[PDB]
Amino acid sequence: METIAKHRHARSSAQKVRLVADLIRGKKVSQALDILTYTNKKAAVLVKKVLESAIANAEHNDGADIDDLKVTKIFVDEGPSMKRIMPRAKGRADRILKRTSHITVVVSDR
Amino acid sequence: MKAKELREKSVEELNTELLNLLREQFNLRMQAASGQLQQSHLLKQVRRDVARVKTLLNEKAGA
Amino acid sequence: DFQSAKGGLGELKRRLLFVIGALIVFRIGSFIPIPGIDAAVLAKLLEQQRGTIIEMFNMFSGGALSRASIFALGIMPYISASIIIQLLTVVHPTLAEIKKEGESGRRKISQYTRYGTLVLAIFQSIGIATGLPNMPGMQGLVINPGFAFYFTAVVSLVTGTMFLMWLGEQITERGIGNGISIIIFAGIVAGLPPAIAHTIEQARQGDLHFLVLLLVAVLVFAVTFFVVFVERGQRRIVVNYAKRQQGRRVYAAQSTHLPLKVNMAGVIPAIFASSIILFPATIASWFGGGTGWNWLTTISLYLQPGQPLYVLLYASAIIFFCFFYTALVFNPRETADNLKKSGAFVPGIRPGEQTAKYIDKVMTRLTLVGALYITFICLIPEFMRDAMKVPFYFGGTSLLIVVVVIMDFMAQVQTLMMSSQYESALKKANLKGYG
Amino acid sequence: GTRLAGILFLLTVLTTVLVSGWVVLGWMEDAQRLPLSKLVLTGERHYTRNDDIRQSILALGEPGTFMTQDVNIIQTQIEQRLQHARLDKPGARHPCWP
Amino acid sequence: RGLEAMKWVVVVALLLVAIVGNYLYRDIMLPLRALAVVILIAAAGGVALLTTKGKATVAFAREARTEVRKVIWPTRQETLHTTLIVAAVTAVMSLILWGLDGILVRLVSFITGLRF
Amino acid sequence: MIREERLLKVLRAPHVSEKASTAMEKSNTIVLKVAKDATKAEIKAAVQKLFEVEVEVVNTLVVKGKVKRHGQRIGRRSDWKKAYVTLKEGQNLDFVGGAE
RNA sequence: CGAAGGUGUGCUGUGAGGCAUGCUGGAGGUAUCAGAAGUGCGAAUGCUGACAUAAGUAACGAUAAAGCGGGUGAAAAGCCC
Ligand SMILES: CCCCCC/C=C/CCCCCCCCCC(=O)O[C@@H](COC(=O)CCCCCCCCCCCCCCC)COP(=O)(O)OC[C@H](O)CO
Ligand SMILES: CCCCCC/C=C/CCCCCCCCCC(=O)O[C@H](COC(=O)CCCCCCCCCCCCCCC)COP(=O)(O)OC[C@H](O)CO
Ligand SMILES: CCCCCC/C=C\CCCCCCCCCC(=O)O[C@@H](COC(=O)CCCCCCCCCCCCCCC)COP(=O)(O)OC[C@H](O)CO
Ligand SMILES: CCCCCC/C=C\CCCCCCCCCC(=O)O[C@H](COC(=O)CCCCCCCCCCCCCCC)COP(=O)(O)OC[C@H](O)CO
Ligand SMILES: CCCCCCCCCCCCCCCCCC(=O)O[C@@H](COC(=O)CCCCCCCCCCCCCCC)COP(=O)(O)OCCN
Ligand SMILES: CCCCCCCCCCCCCCCCCC(=O)O[C@@H](COC(=O)CCCCCCCCCCCCCCC)COP(=O)(O)OCCN
Ligand SMILES: CCCCCCCCCCCCCCCCCC(=O)O[C@@H](COC(=O)CCCCCCCCCCCCCCC)COP(=O)(O)OCCN
Ligand SMILES: CCCCCCCCCCCCCCCCCC(=O)O[C@@H](COC(=O)CCCCCCCCCCCCCCC)COP(=O)(O)OCCN
Ligand SMILES: CCCCCCCCCCCCCCCCCC(=O)O[C@@H](COC(=O)CCCCCCCCCCCCCCC)COP(=O)(O)OCCN
Ligand SMILES: CCCCCCCCCCCCCCCCCC(=O)O[C@@H](COC(=O)CCCCCCCCCCCCCCC)COP(=O)(O)OCCN
Ligand SMILES: CCCCCCCCCCCCCCCCCC(=O)O[C@@H](COC(=O)CCCCCCCCCCCCCCC)COP(=O)(O)OCCN
Ligand SMILES: CCCCCCCCCCCCCCCCCC(=O)O[C@H](COC(=O)CCCCCCCCCCCCCCC)COP(=O)(O)OCCN
């Protein structure tokens, strides 16, 4: 709506962030996001910050209700692949891509 | 610039440039470089004035 | 300024009460003879001009067991109020009622310090009020619910002062000094001398009226210039700003480091000069043998057993007292060190110790700005223009006191009209401690 | 504790104290032995009078000191990076099969 | 230059003429038992300072010039003018007060000190 | 004369700030940035003719500058020399040394 | 008072393609006829840039093992003590 929050351009395996997007999708706020703070992966506590910021924007500034706020759509789209080298072996080198993501949270009405 | 140069005289100008350089720029540039009398406009002058005197000497042996 | 934050519920409906109930504060000091009426806000004898005569000393305003002077009893009550506000905050985290709680703690300590200062306010009225009914001052009749005289004389005089005192420590939410002093300015000014503003005698300068009024306007003017710090660090010049971009290029320019810097020297007293000149001339003359004060009435000067020897000794002492004292135990400059770890990169970081014997000698030799402030506002009624034996040709305690509220008006409003403060650039830096 | 605070009390007290000590003596002294009533006129007044006779001497100011300071220059985390191409494929292979 | 010395110029003009004149002032040129020895004392002190000139005594300038001169320098640096305009609204208020007061104190005096 | 004004052009800034440059003036020596003259003898004779400072051993050391590691082209700060001039008399209190 | 291009759509010619039009877009583009081309791309172990695939796979650089308690900090198996 106008309550959203998003993140762009930070190193992280984007596929792993993709898994936890689905997990909490459409399951509202602070009642299925508590999962994240008590489970595996640092991808969990990475999308947690994006969630609780959207919430804080539907509270302070625009809106005033966070118990009438549901995390409707949450996904994450492939970011940049920042080229780098690994000297692989035998004078032959092969590219390492430094995977990145653009985390996209879209909270709306509950 | 103009009248400055023109009124210079050999004997005179010789002893005047010693004053210019030493103890009117010598002090200044040291003080200024430590922030204890740093005034940037004063740095621009004196420097580009002591220069002038030496010009006349190697050009025509003073004015 | 006058503010409200008074105890019990609300603070914005305590503001409603405040202006209306200031009528009640004026009324009970003036009238109602049950807890006295004399000597706190109420003059019992009409009009104004000296009531002690036949001495050079009596020109200043003299006396004769206790003294002939306009209301605001003793000296003890008001002076100790600001001192113990300062003292308990700085010295005592233990056996104090604040540990410094911000703005809330400024008002908190004032309440407790009033009780601590109430004891001091007692002491002078013990001597005054046993002598008092045998000379002017006796009220019109006190009904007296008591049946004593021993505590009874003491109580009546104190209580009148106490009403003014209570409200005066209530307004001190924003908690600065030079607050106490303003309340105290009002009483002395109101009584003392406009009936003839400078006594005339058809002479060189005493020959016209409303002379005194002109003099006061410069005296404020000095105090407002006083708050200006002194500044100047290494500072360099401003060359750069910077822009936001993802690659940088240039940053850094001006930087200010405080060893402490001059904080102004003459600061704090507000009646100081006038009494210094007065005492050693008098004590030699006629509490000993000899003579010598101000004399004549012309521009033949005189003014020779006082004036600038008052300055050197006392002046130097007081100003160094600021710097030195505090520096040994608990000082602003401690503040500087903490607040400037974020300073690091360019102006210095860990060295031996930040500053040393440099700051020491600095504050020492100085003394000149201590001379300037102290002499300029007080010299004005000391010389005036002549040497006449009418008031304001040595002594000027009356015109010293007034200036304080006058300064306030422009300064205080800027702080009030926003929830101000400043700074935001850090969160406590990460420590790398080695070497 | 603070020693500056101790001075502050001392100065304020001192200025007042000298006036008060002096004042009690101060009158105009002399121990005149009274001409008594042999007619004449007695008493005096001044034009107005400076209140009734009770001690008022008054003072005080502030805890003192003034400050100003400057703040500028904060906040950049910025990147800049580079890379270049390469080639390499070595020999060390004999292709015959016996 | 002017940062390495100051005092000398103003001494000379006064020295040449003033001393003789000083005796005369307020109609005295006459022995009260002698006088006129005042001329010697006036001259004598100027001698002392002049002959000790190098970094000249009283305050001096070997190392002691840097002391005083650089605690003077930052203090008088700041701009007086900027403050002055702001100040002069407080100034005019002050003047009014010190003629005003007398009426109010006289008023309260009358209606007090009398109680039944 | 013994030397010209251009052999007395040798100082353009002292060093009087931070570690081993406040510490090593109070405790010992004196230190100043000495242009890029590449001499030791004329720096001894600099503080003789100008000033009135007396010295012990004069120590010369080349300073190769230091990196500015954000590029554009070459970067880096320019060369200069540091010299521990070393007091034997003077005992100067900073921005004094002599001058008559 | 909305060009080119981009992107959807309709119509039309045997076709190469053309025309119209919504949206995006925010400025220039060009009936008609003739002349001239670095004139049409999918492959050349083509060339260049970008982004895939295998894959969240192999590996994470010595078999000289590390564990605990405080400290800092947003967070300590790795840092400091
Ligand atoms: C208007 C407000 C005041 C302004 C002016 C004064 C400002 C003073 C400045 C700072 C404030 C200092 C506060 C000090 C508080 C602690 C005093 C103290 O410590 O007093 C001691 C002495 O008492 C004794 O003389 C008990 C007997 C005392 C008899 C009378 C003499 C009192 C002397 C007071 C001296 C004050 C100045 C010096 C303070 C350092 C207590 O006994 P001790 O066995 O030694 O204690 C040992 C351990 O510390 C605790 O077990
Ligand atoms: C350099 C700094 C100087 C600072 C002080 C300056 C003081 C100036 C004095 C007066 C102001 C100008 C007066 C203008 C003329 C007025 C009339 C006149 O000339 O008055 C005379 C003034 O004498 C008198 O000041 C006699 C006394 C004069 C004493 C002068 C002492 C100077 C001491 C200087 C010491 C070194 C300071 C160095 C500072 C850097 C006489 O005094 P009257 O009371 O008139 O006596 C009545 C007359 O006889 C008949 O009417
Ligand atoms: C200088 C010495 C060494 C070098 C020269 C040596 C010369 C030979 C040595 C001695 C000569 C023989 C002995 C002479 C003794 C003379 C004594 C004398 O004659 O002393 C007179 C006062 O001299 C006074 O300097 C009175 C002074 C009054 C106070 C002055 C205050 C200072 C004024 C400013 C001084 C100059 C400041 C600037 C300096 C650069 C006595 O005054 P009477 O006339 O009585 O009047 C006094 C009363 O008004 C009425 O009673
Ligand atoms: C032949 C020899 C004759 C000798 C006698 C000579 C007598 C007349 C001469 C001099 C008298 C003073 C005249 C000039 C006054 C100037 C006041 C002024 O303009 O004061 C300004 C400051 O404000 C301030 O004091 C603010 C306040 C300024 C006004 C103060 C007015 C006081 C007046 C007192 C009068 C009392 C009279 C008697 C009353 C009974 C000066 O600022 P600047 O230094 O320029 O700025 C410096 C820059 O910021 C930084 O580089
Ligand atoms: C100025 C405008 C007019 C004001 C009129 C006031 C009318 C009453 C309103 C409010 C009560 C007083 C508020 C200010 C109290 C300041 C002192 C204070 O804070 O007192 C205590 C807190 O007080 C409160 O919280 C408010 C008062 C408590 C309730 C009082 C109930 C009785 C009220 C009787 C009023 C009678 C009025 C009669 C008028 C003719 C705390 O004391 P302490 O911790 O500082 O020290 C301990 C003792 N040494
Ligand atoms: C600026 C204007 C002026 C201001 C005021 C100036 C100062 C005041 C002026 C003049 C007055 C000066 C007064 C000086 C102090 C006087 C002290 C005094 O009066 O002391 C007497 C006070 O005497 C009494 O009060 C009598 C005793 C009463 C005791 C009451 C309590 C007893 C409780 C016992 C309970 C059981 C035991 C408990 C044990 C812990 C005792 O003196 P003395 O007989 O020892 O001296 C003899 C040599 N001259
Ligand atoms: C050591 C004295 C310090 C005095 C400090 C103040 C000076 C102020 C300057 C000028 C005004 C006073 C002039 C005094 C002239 C004295 C003339 C004289 O000698 O008078 C008699 C003597 O006068 C004195 O001795 C002066 C008074 C002595 C007692 C008071 C001493 C006060 C000391 C104050 C010290 C603290 C000063 C602090 C200054 C910042 C003559 O003796 P007699 O005929 O009376 O017979 C002997 C006595 N019965
Ligand atoms: C503020 C902190 C510092 C305090 C201590 C400062 C001490 C400074 C030292 C010296 C300055 C003395 C200034 C006071 C002079 C007082 C003169 C005086 O009172 O004169 C009267 C006479 O007083 C005396 O005789 C006793 C005081 C004398 C003090 C010393 C005066 C020295 C004058 C120069 C002497 C030259 C001697 C020459 C000898 C041949 C005149 O009496 P009258 O009836 O004619 O006039 C009306 C009343 N004033
Ligand atoms: C006030 C003391 C403060 C002490 C503070 C703590 C300790 C710090 C250490 C040292 C500082 C001492 C105070 C210095 C105050 C400033 C003095 C000053 O700046 O004087 C200047 C002006 O000095 C003078 O004018 C000296 C004049 C001396 C001769 C006086 C002749 C007239 C005498 C009249 C008669 C007096 C008779 C008295 C006895 C009857 C210096 O001029 P300049 O800038 O050229 O510096 C180089 C000087 N070589
Ligand atoms: C009515 C006014 C009442 C207050 C007066 C001022 C109060 C000032 C506050 C405290 C004074 C000192 C209390 C005792 C401190 C003991 C511990 C200490 O550090 O003592 C030092 C000694 O005490 C001092 O240095 C005190 C210095 C200030 C004293 C000021 C005078 C106080 C008394 C004035 C009475 C009235 C005098 C009137 C004169 C006309 C040790 O020496 P040091 O600092 O060099 O360190 C040595 C080891 N490295
Ligand atoms: C129980 C504990 C709590 C209460 C304690 C109360 C008592 C102690 C408190 C305070 C001390 C008060 C001053 C005591 C000494 C001075 C008074 C004195 O000596 O009085 C006698 C002398 O009285 C006089 O001479 C009259 C003047 C007395 C006040 C003098 C004040 C002098 C102040 C000097 C300050 C000096 C400052 C120096 C530094 C600038 C009384 O004589 P008498 O018995 O014959 O009674 C006569 C009554 N008219
Ligand atoms: C003890 C009964 C008589 C007084 C009752 C209290 C009157 C309060 C009203 C007004 C205050 C101003 C006038 C006070 C007159 C003097 C009272 C006095 O001296 O009481 C002494 C006794 O005082 C004490 O025991 C307490 C002393 C300290 C506290 C004093 C507090 C006074 C104000 C209380 C107000 C309470 C209510 C406030 C809210 C409405 C001596 O007793 P006595 O007068 O009966 O004489 C017989 C012995 N010679």
UniProtKB/TrEMBL annotation, chain D:
Organismal lineage: Bacteria, Pseudomonadati, Pseudomonadota, Gammaproteobacteria, Enterobacterales
Transmembrane segments: 4-28
GO BP term, pick one: cell septum assembly
One cellular component term from this protein's GO annotations in UniProt: plasma membrane
Chief place of localization: membrane
Residue window of the full protein shown: 22 to 103 of 276
Assigned protein family: Belongs to the FtsQ/DivIB family. FtsQ subfamily.
Keywords carried by this UniProt record: Cell cycle, Cell division, Cell inner membrane, Cell membrane, Membrane, Transmembrane, Transmembrane helix
Function of the molecule: Essential cell division protein. May link together the upstream cell division proteins, which are predominantly cytoplasmic, with the downstream cell division proteins, which are predominantly periplasmic. May control correct divisome assembly.
Name of protein: Cell division protein FtsQ
Compartment(s) where it occurs, according to its Swiss-Prot or TrEMBL record: Cell inner membrane; Membrane
Keyword Secreted carried by entry: no
Subunit structure: Part of a complex composed of FtsB, FtsL and FtsQ.
Entry superkingdom: Bacteria
